[PDB]
């Protein structure tokens, strides 16, 4: 267990604020991205795979000036020296009201220098969509 | 991605209600368990490792008649055909008021028959401890 993920969250949401279109560089060809959703009834949204499809859904959601302030991060370890991260903070896309969320990250070793890994899984959900 | 974790949550919280002392059978010698916490100031609690220490903290928290009703579960896939689970529901230990929580599971292949895996990571947090 190390703070590799803690310093990874340090740069993730910073990128999500500045250039959300560059967020796809974190993901490989074996990554799982989940956001939103709903969609569109009430049941949780589906998952997208592949860097081409992940970037496609990120651009669709439009993180225009999406500011973030995290309040809690849990980072430990898993298989292949991978660090799992449980994120819980507040999100505000396009200067909207803050939304409590629970996000989970899976970071697998990159392949060159092995840091700061690459997001193998990105499951994001809003609390207001569940209660 | 498969509903292996969905049918795993099916039996996890059921065990947490009935026999919380048997919950340690899910974990191996390389598992990470987090609950509570706080503790005890305000900062998030530490993580325990090893089946002997995990069971030690579970028994301490006393899940006496701890009933649970999950409202959302996200299960996909990771490395070594492992299924990650993001749980979000309501918890009530000892017939207390319901508490919104966000729990994350990492399920690594067992070694014999390979289902229903074994909990490699169990990070649990209450929302009321964060906001």
Residue numbers in the entry:
A (entry chain A), B (entry chain A): 8 to 138
Task: Give verbatim excerpts from the published study on this entry.
Ras GTPase Activating Protein SH3 Domain Binding Protein (G3BP), a 52 kDa protein highly overexpressed in various cancer tumors, has in the last couple of years proved to be a significant cancer marker protein and a potential drug target. G3BP is involved in several cellular functions and is implicated for example in stress granule assembly, RNA metabolism and hereby cell motility, nuclear transportation and NFkappaB, Ras and Wnt signaling. In addition to the PxxP motifs, G3BP also contains glutamine- and glycine rich regions, an RNA recognition motif (RRM) and an N-terminal NTF2-like domain ranging from residue 11–134 in human G3BP1. The NTF2-like domain forms a homo-dimer with each molecule composed of three alpha helices (αI–III) lined up against a beta sheet made up by five beta strands (βI–V).
Initially, we were focusing our studies on the G3BP1 11–139 construct under the assumption that the N-terminal residues would be disordered and likely to interfere with crystal packing. Initially, we obtained hexagonal crystals of G3BP1 10–139 diffracting to around 3.3 Å. Two crystal structures of the G3BP1 NTF2-like domain, residues 11–139 and 1–139, were determined to resolutions of 3.3 and 1.6 Å, respectively. The 3.3 Å crystal structure of G3BP1 was solved in space group P6322 with one molecule in the asymmetric unit whereas two molecules describe the 1.6 Å structure in space group P212121. The low resolution structure was determined using combined molecular replacement and SIRAS phasing. The structure was refined to final Rwork and Rfree values of 30 and 36%, respectively, including 131 protein residues and one phosphate ion. Two loop regions, Gly43-Ala52 (loop III) and Pro116-Phe124 (loop VII), proved difficult to model but the electron density, including an un-biased density modified SIRAS map, suggested that these loops could tentatively be modeled, providing at least an approximate location. The phosphate ion occupies a special position in the crystal lattice, surrounded by six symmetry related copies of Arg107. The difference in resolution and space group between G3BP1 1–139 and 11–139 can be assigned to crystal packing effects largely caused by the N-terminal residues. Crystal packing is denser in the G3BP1 1–139 structure as compared to the 11–139 structure with estimated solvent contents of 42 and 56 percent, respectively.
